Design a protein around this ligand. Sequence first.
Ligand SMILES: [Cl-]
Ligand SMILES: [Cl-]
Ligand SMILES: [Cl-]
Ligand SMILES: [Cl-]
Lengths: 337, 337
Amino acid sequence: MSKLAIIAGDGIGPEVTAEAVKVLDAVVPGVQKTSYDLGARRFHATGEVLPDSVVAELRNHDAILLGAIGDPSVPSGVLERGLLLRLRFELDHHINLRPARLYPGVASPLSGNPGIDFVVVREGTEGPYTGNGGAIRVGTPNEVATEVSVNTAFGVRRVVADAFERARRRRKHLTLVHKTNVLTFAGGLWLRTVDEVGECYPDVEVAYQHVDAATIHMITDPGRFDVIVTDNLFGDIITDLAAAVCGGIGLAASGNIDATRANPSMFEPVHGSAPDIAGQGIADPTAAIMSVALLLSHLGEHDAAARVDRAVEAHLATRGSERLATSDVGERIAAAL
Amino acid sequence: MSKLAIIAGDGIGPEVTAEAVKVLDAVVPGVQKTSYDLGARRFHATGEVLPDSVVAELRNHDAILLGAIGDPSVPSGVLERGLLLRLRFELDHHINLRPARLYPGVASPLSGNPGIDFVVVREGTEGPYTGNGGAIRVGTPNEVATEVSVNTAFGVRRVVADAFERARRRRKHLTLVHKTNVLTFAGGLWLRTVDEVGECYPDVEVAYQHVDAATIHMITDPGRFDVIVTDNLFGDIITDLAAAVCGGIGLAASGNIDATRANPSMFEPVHGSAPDIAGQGIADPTAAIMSVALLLSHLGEHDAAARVDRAVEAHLATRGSERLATSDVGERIAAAL
Ligand SMILES: [Cl-]
Ligand SMILES: [Cl-]
Ligand SMILES: [Cl-]
Ligand SMILES: [Cl-]
């Protein structure tokens, strides 16, 4: 560790990030924390979404911890395209890491408390989610709109390697999810890349599923997954579905990772800013604290990451249906370190 | 009255289609049936997949009933592209109808057998599941592969207008599912079309969800859905998920509809040809027979469909668990007709 940039952000972001920082501070004292004003607040106060100068500041830190971004006062798509996706592009966050574990003390919407323990590695910087396309004759019966997905061996190989590495360190099973029968170009790039990278991992079993069939299995047989690798668009959907089967996006954490370490990687809870309860001390910081565990693991603070994991798991196992304030949750987790 | 084209097809196609035909003319008298050897048989027999002479022949019937196509026997893609997709595009099947109901006697993989009854209207003839794209420098670190989704006012309004009608005639709720914040061109088109079409349907409440959200809600709160309208790519994913939560693709029916009636529409059970049980009279013919009810309800023949429905429901609500042969299940469905 050493230097952490903190982007507490909007609505519930501050109050959950404060509890995350507390847990970090307990397992790794004397980290330099630097706080950046980004999102709705910054957007109103200055007109700025993501200045290049702020991006450069961000580079001076070992990692970034983010809370949540967004407010109904700021238009729909703007911070999301201009701050969230832009940071992902500018910091080369090509690996979106989305763990999906079902924990004692958490209800699944699936029948019969199945064992669920997998990880999704989503490609973060290419494919359909870059804004490539256009329209003509807008607002007429003659309108035509095109969306273009660009995929590269550069991009794909990166993310696939990382997923194989994760698979080797876990249960040695990798599932590629795509739609190769219909996206024959992107799909074939993905298939061949997994096969070629797979040559270096004769220990990892590799399977393939179409995204519609994988969606079905996540509901009927989620125990079959160890590591899933996929693209930006399909990953967007299946990481949220994973979260849902593991008891909701409110209990999910995310890494946005440049595996070359050339740039600092960013960690956050998956949930959003929930402005209707902002400042009230209701928001659960468990997700934010679980993102701290990801961050620590990424920085090689593995013993300290295990400690946070164990302390989250302990909290979830005894919380029950008790009404717990944001700071009561943070205290319970802290006391279990 | 009616001319039906029948393409039993491959593997278990013949067997479940035999039942559906049996059900059919036992509720509508003068159905003039024509058999079509299309699929693996025809291919192996002749080399033919779907000659133009044959499409022109199909156009002279009032509907098409299909069982299944595909065999490992036939090289990947030959029939799916050259028969199945080609028929969809040639016959202008712009509406893909995928009803989603959890019936009595059917166990859902979701918690607490919840209320689920909705319909998915999926755009059928545009988007990226068209084959539009390419690659350069294949098989090198410099490989780049593109997929292109073409979306039109023409294609979109038709599908959307058909959805609003389905909504009116049901619980007057329509959900548009897309990803408008990042597929900004396609997204904008779909949004604006739903708004504009919806001004002849003030009876219909209109809701928007991003596809990632919809997938979460399909598993945590599927009861909030009546009609879903979406594009080809997102519909392909959400249709399979709806089936799963309503007890499986094995119990799902699909309409492929030219809502201008210039071409005959096609109806089929969702499941494939299952080469592994071809000819053992094991295959369950229920969905094939559910596909007849959509074929009927589309041809204006409400009461024969209104019936046939009930005979299927009876079948499912009373089957218990005993292994039934194809022809048995077929015979059972008669009774309540
Ligand atoms: Cl956020
Ligand atoms: Cl991992
Ligand atoms: Cl996201
Ligand atoms: Cl309907």
